[PDB]
Amino acid sequence: FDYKEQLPESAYMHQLLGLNLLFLLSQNRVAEFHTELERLPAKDIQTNVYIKHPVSLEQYLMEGSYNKVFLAKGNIPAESYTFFIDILLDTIRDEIAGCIEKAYEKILFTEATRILFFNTPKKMTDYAKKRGWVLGPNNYYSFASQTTIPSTELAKQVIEYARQLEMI
């Protein structure tokens, strides 16, 4: 980026910049990800595959399109992207599990396998042991575990009103 002119640019530049964007996404530094992404020229962000795949992957992650995020594992425009993508998949497994925790008053197992994108009941059982589930007594993971006036804070606010009125 520094030595514009006096240099002819390297064809590997866009690929390696996209790899850096993948690294930033994997480490979950979204602000720095977007900041560096802004460095890429417009048409480079919009057309070049190496810069489109990282940005599209962030778009899918923000939307929740975990299916397409997983399909990125097959997309992989450059094979070197696998390393920074595997850790992102594991973090996304955690994020999907959090979504499942909050939603899904009740969920089964045979379909929860596809939902979590796992391929083995042993992996399913290990992951359930991770964090902790009810194992599906009726084959259903029933993780349905869902006053107190802030009187102190409200009194502080009202006293602030009084003080701001009386310092006249």
Binding site: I159, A162, L165, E166
Partner: protein, 65 residues
């Protein structure tokens, strides 16, 4: 943290447990009040101690505390 006057009135206490009735002192709500002239005099005496530039809201908050 209180008024200087505690008012009591003697009254016979008919105990429910059959103990003999005995005269006892019973509290009555006591407060300090002033005639017009008494208020004038006390205000003159407290002219420099009593703080009146407090504001109604500040005085009420002081009453709450």
């Amino acid at each position: 943290l209180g008024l200087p006057t505690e008012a009591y009135i003697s009254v016979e206490e008919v105990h429910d447990d059959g103990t003999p009735t005995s005269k006892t002192f019973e509290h009555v709500t006591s407060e300090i009040g002033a005639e017009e002239a008494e208020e004038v005099g006390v205000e003159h005496l407290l002219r420099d101690i009593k703080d009146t530039t407090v504001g109604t809201l500040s005085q009420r908050i002081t009453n709450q505390v």
